[PDB]
Design an enzyme around this catalytic site. Structure first.
Site, mmCIF file in Angstrom:
data_model
loop_
_atom_site.group_PDB
_atom_site.id
_atom_site.type_symbol
_atom_site.label_atom_id
_atom_site.label_comp_id
_atom_site.label_asym_id
_atom_site.label_seq_id
_atom_site.Cartn_x
_atom_site.Cartn_y
_atom_site.Cartn_z
ATOM 1 N N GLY A 1 11.298 1.071 -7.509
ATOM 2 C CA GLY A 1 11.287 0.010 -6.509
ATOM 3 C C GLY A 1 10.258 -1.068 -6.824
ATOM 4 O O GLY A 1 9.275 -0.810 -7.519
ATOM 5 N N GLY B 1 8.428 -4.368 -4.456
ATOM 6 C CA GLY B 1 8.189 -5.346 -3.396
ATOM 7 C C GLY B 1 7.674 -6.691 -3.942
ATOM 8 O O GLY B 1 7.580 -6.900 -5.157
ATOM 9 N N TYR C 1 4.562 -7.656 -3.539
ATOM 10 C CA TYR C 1 3.235 -7.362 -4.049
ATOM 11 C C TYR C 1 3.282 -6.089 -4.890
ATOM 12 O O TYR C 1 2.444 -5.202 -4.733
ATOM 13 C CB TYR C 1 2.179 -7.337 -2.942
ATOM 14 C CG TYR C 1 2.156 -8.521 -1.981
ATOM 15 C CD1 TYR C 1 3.058 -8.584 -0.916
ATOM 16 C CD2 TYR C 1 1.210 -9.545 -2.096
ATOM 17 C CE1 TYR C 1 3.036 -9.637 -0.010
ATOM 18 C CE2 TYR C 1 1.172 -10.599 -1.190
ATOM 19 C CZ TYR C 1 2.095 -10.645 -0.149
ATOM 20 O OH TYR C 1 2.125 -11.641 0.784
ATOM 21 N N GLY C 2 4.280 -6.005 -5.781
ATOM 22 C CA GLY C 2 4.183 -5.177 -6.973
ATOM 23 C C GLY C 2 5.407 -4.302 -7.226
ATOM 24 O O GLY C 2 6.546 -4.684 -6.970
ATOM 25 N N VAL C 3 5.138 -3.109 -7.761
ATOM 26 C CA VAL C 3 6.190 -2.187 -8.169
ATOM 27 C C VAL C 3 5.862 -0.783 -7.640
ATOM 28 O O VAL C 3 4.707 -0.462 -7.388
ATOM 29 C CB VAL C 3 6.288 -2.208 -9.709
ATOM 30 C CG1 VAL C 3 4.968 -1.862 -10.396
ATOM 31 C CG2 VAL C 3 7.395 -1.294 -10.215
ATOM 32 N N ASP D 1 9.947 -3.906 10.721
ATOM 33 C CA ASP D 1 10.910 -4.037 9.645
ATOM 34 C C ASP D 1 11.707 -2.750 9.480
ATOM 35 O O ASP D 1 11.894 -2.302 8.342
ATOM 36 C CB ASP D 1 10.244 -4.359 8.327
ATOM 37 C CG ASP D 1 11.159 -5.054 7.331
ATOM 38 O OD1 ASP D 1 12.267 -5.468 7.734
ATOM 39 O OD2 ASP D 1 10.743 -5.187 6.173
ATOM 40 N N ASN E 1 14.229 0.936 4.340
ATOM 41 C CA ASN E 1 12.824 1.273 4.524
ATOM 42 C C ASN E 1 12.691 2.650 5.195
ATOM 43 O O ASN E 1 11.636 2.963 5.732
ATOM 44 C CB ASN E 1 12.146 0.224 5.412
ATOM 45 C CG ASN E 1 11.943 -1.104 4.729
ATOM 46 O OD1 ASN E 1 12.053 -1.208 3.507
ATOM 47 N ND2 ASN E 1 11.624 -2.151 5.471
ATOM 48 N N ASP F 1 7.578 1.634 4.324
ATOM 49 C CA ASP F 1 7.345 0.209 4.174
ATOM 50 C C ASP F 1 6.685 -0.413 5.407
ATOM 51 O O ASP F 1 7.327 -1.199 6.090
ATOM 52 C CB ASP F 1 8.539 -0.594 3.675
ATOM 53 C CG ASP F 1 8.142 -1.940 3.045
ATOM 54 O OD1 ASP F 1 6.942 -2.352 3.188
ATOM 55 O OD2 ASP F 1 9.000 -2.567 2.359
HETATM 56 C C1 HHT Z 1 9.621 1.962 -2.535
HETATM 57 O O1 HHT Z 1 8.456 2.300 -1.774
HETATM 58 C C2 HHT Z 1 8.180 3.639 -1.584
HETATM 59 C C3 HHT Z 1 9.010 4.652 -2.023
HETATM 60 C C4 HHT Z 1 8.633 5.972 -1.809
HETATM 61 BR BR1 HHT Z 1 9.795 7.312 -2.424
HETATM 62 C C5 HHT Z 1 7.466 6.329 -1.190
HETATM 63 C C6 HHT Z 1 6.640 5.289 -0.743
HETATM 64 C C7 HHT Z 1 6.952 3.949 -0.933
HETATM 65 C C8 HHT Z 1 6.033 2.853 -0.488
HETATM 66 C C9 HHT Z 1 6.399 2.222 0.850
HETATM 67 O O2 HHT Z 1 7.040 2.900 1.658
HETATM 68 O O3 HHT Z 1 6.007 1.076 1.092
HETATM 69 C C1 HHT Z 2 2.458 -1.664 -14.152
HETATM 70 O O1 HHT Z 2 1.523 -0.627 -14.459
HETATM 71 C C2 HHT Z 2 1.276 0.462 -13.637
HETATM 72 C C3 HHT Z 2 1.949 0.705 -12.447
HETATM 73 C C4 HHT Z 2 1.627 1.826 -11.698
HETATM 74 BR BR1 HHT Z 2 2.567 2.120 -10.055
HETATM 75 C C5 HHT Z 2 0.646 2.705 -12.117
HETATM 76 C C6 HHT Z 2 -0.043 2.446 -13.298
HETATM 77 C C7 HHT Z 2 0.271 1.353 -14.099
HETATM 78 C C8 HHT Z 2 -0.481 1.036 -15.357
HETATM 79 C C9 HHT Z 2 -1.196 -0.304 -15.169
HETATM 80 O O2 HHT Z 2 -2.103 -0.411 -14.311
HETATM 81 O O3 HHT Z 2 -0.787 -1.266 -15.847
#
Ligand code: HHT
Ligand code: HHT
Ligand code: HHT
Ligand code: HHT
Ligand code: HHT
Ligand code: HHT
Lengths: 262, 300
Positions: free
Chosen positions: B15, B17, B19-21, B131, B136, B149
């Site tokens: 996944g 969002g 603000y990241g992955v 949301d 979510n 989420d």
């Molecule tokens: C794609 O995001 C998740 C997926 C899983 Br499985 C657990 C937790 C999260 C973070 C969130 O709930 O914000």
């Molecule tokens: C995109 O990279 C990551 C994503 C997650 Br979730 C954990 C650790 C890494 C290595 C890094 O900090 O680059």
């Protein structure tokens, strides 16, 4: 109706009562602070009052910031030249938590008269987050006050504003308010405001909800009454200036009562 | 933060969002499977994002079997890592995998009961989710479903103050937000759950608008255009327009035909126009719809 969350107000009040204890600062941190005093903290908080009115921040934001500052200074020794940086990062974090439209970091750097860099503010932000362990959803005086307001019959905006005003005064003086919980200062503020405006008293309905009586509130009440009487003379005046505004029904112009009969 | 990245072994992306992955990862020492959310910092040069400050502060305080668990937070100067419990799927993917099967009624009832539990717990801790939608909501192989989420969540005071208007994915957004009401409350999360309830039964969104006005219009065409009688104050609301078409309320058995009398009762109370009359999560737990409720594992 639902805006006062009938099905949850009791649960929430109970939960805030628990959390305010976990979010409580150390009552005697200033003695352990070698280079800062209650008087310097007063200057900082008074400044933050002015920052909030210039950026039109919520009062809740002000209260959160003060909570963050007090908790920070409870474990972190700070030189007087850095007290403002702590306060600024606090106000930034509180803004991000509580405001729909927080001021930008740049705006926070600006209000410091270039005393500090953007880099310094963001680094302090990290530091404060580390020290608080991200525990930012702290109960404030205001969160208690707004619930207490639901027990007025009828609602009085002069009462409400005056209570807010008194609660805010208490932010300024660690001694003696660092020794009282938010819920208790709110209770004292509410009774004092109610008594001043309408002559009435802390209601039985709020005895039922808080377990607090005029007896349990008396120490804080005596302090807050003195603070109210002496407020025109206090070195810090930003809260009084603020509460002249009609936004707040000009409540800082009301005369304190001479005696409480308590 | 007993966490330290070294002990995690990446498995696969799961996944992304704003603000990241998010990555599925495995704790090399305990064996635990986790979801790592990386929050990129100063990518806006404004410090730690408000969404992340809210998600961490509120999820740290919310410990409920039907709320996703934040297990730890790794705080590096350039990167924030959120360590979550791992769940295998979200409800959107399951409904889509359940295309022509349907979701069995015991599973719908179990999921709705658990959702309401998690939501009541949020509201009792002065947290609005803001949301709720199938994407979510996370499900596991043991039959649990959890609110996830919390990127748009917010700690509220009592009574509520005015909060952000740009809240809730459109298809799941309550009428009072659409009408630009000064205040909204816990009722907006119930509206979302109501939409989700219907969607679990039909496997299609109940009100798939493509704009704010189209969203309203679709709601009005299903539930009838609200007037002062059903919803006092409605005609005064900032984005209420007198010119609104006045659609008749269709009989509720037509809105979700396969649903039984209890289900229709419950659904009607979740989608009540007036936020004051809309059922709470706490009260909904006791609705007769749940009399026979159990917790079976998912069927797929
Ligand atoms: C794609 O995001 C998740 C997926 C899983 Br499985 C657990 C937790 C999260 C973070 C969130 O709930 O914000
Ligand atoms: C995109 O990279 C990551 C994503 C997650 Br979730 C954990 C650790 C890494 C290595 C890094 O900090 O680059
Ligand atoms: C004592 O120094 C300060 C303390 C505060 Br609070 C505000 C402003 C100043 C002067 C400056 O920052 O230039
Ligand atoms: C950034 O530091 C933390 C963040 C979280 Br969440 C928990 C604990 C810590 C360290 C501490 O407990 O002081
Ligand atoms: C005085 O007892 C209570 C009253 C309420 Br309402 C909430 C919590 C407590 C425990 C405490 O705060 O000591
Ligand atoms: C996104 O990448 C990672 C995710 C995790 Br979990 C750990 C380490 C990395 C670095 C890499 O190998 O890229």
């Amino acid at each position: 109706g639902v805006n006062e969350v009938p099905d949850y107000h009791e649960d929430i009040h109970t939960y805030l009562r628990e959390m305010e204890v976990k979010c409580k600062p150390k009552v005697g941190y200033m003695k352990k602070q070698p280079d800062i005093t209650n008087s310097m903290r007063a200057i900082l908080v008074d400044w933050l009052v002015e920052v909030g009115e210039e950026y039109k921040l919520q009062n809740e934001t002000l209260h959160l910031a003060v909570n963050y500052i007090d908790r920070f200074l409870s474990s972190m020794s700070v030189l007087r030249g850095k007290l403002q940086l702590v306060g600024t990062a606090a106000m930034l974090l509180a803004s991000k938590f509580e405001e729909i439209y927080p001021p930008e970091v740049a705006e926070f750097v600006y209000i410091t008269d270039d005393t500090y860099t953007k880099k310094q503010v963001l680094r302090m932000e990290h530091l404060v987050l580390k020290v608080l362990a991200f525990d930012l959803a702290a109960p404030t005086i205001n969160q208690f006050l707004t619930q207490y307001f639901l027990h007025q019959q009828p609602a009085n905006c002069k009462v409400e504003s005056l209570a807010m005003f008194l609660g805010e005064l208490s932010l300024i003086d660690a001694d003696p308010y660092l020794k009282y919980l938010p819920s208790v200062i709110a209770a004292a503020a509410f009774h004092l405001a109610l008594y001043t405006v309408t002559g009435q008293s802390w209601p039985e309905s709020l005895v039922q909800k808080t377990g607090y009586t005029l007896e349990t509130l008396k120490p804080c009440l005596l302090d807050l009454h003195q603070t109210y009487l002496r407020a025109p003379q206090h070195a810090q005046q930003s809260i009084r200036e603020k509460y002249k505004n009609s936004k707040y029904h000009g409540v800082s112009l009301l005369n304190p009562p001479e005696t409480l009969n308590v | 933060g007993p966490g330290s990245m070294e002990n995690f072994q990446k498995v696969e992306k799961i996944g992304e969002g704003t603000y990241g992955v998010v990555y599925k990862a495995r704790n090399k020492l305990t064996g635990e499977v986790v979801a790592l959310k990386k929050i990129r910092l100063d990518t806006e040069t404004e410090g730690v994002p408000s969404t992340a400050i809210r998600e961490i502060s509120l999820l740290k305080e919310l410990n409920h079997p039907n709320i996703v668990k934040l297990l730890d937070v790794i705080h590096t100067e350039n990167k924030l890592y959120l360590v979550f419990e791992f769940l295998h799927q979200d409800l959107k993917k399951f409904m889509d995998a359940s295309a022509l099967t349907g979701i069995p009624l015991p599973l719908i009832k179990s999921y709705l009961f658990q959702l309401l539990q998690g939501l009541a717990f949020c509201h009792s801790h002065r947290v609005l989710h803001r949301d709720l939608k199938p994407q979510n909501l996370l499900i596991n192989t043991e039959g649990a479903i959890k609110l996830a989420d919390f990127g748009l969540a917010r700690a509220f005071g009592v009574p509520v103050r005015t909060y952000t208007h740009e809240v809730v994915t459109l298809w799941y957004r309550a009428p009072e937000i659409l009408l630009g009401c000064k205040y909204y409350s816990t009722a907006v999360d119930i509206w979302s759950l109501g939409c989700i309830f219907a969607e679990m039964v039909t496997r299609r969104a109940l009100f798939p608008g493509d704009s704010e006005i189209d969203q309203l219009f679709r709601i009005f065409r299903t539930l009838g255009t609200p007037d002062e009688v059903v919803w006092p104050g409605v005609t005064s609301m900032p984005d209420y327009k007198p010119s609104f078409p006045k659609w008749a309320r269709q009989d509720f058995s037509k809105v979700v035909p396969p649903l039984d009398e209890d289900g229709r009762s419950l659904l009607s109370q979740m989608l009540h126009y007036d936020p004051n009359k809309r059922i709470s999560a706490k009260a909904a737990l006791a609705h007769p719809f749940f009399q026979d409720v159990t917790k079976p594992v998912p069927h797929l």
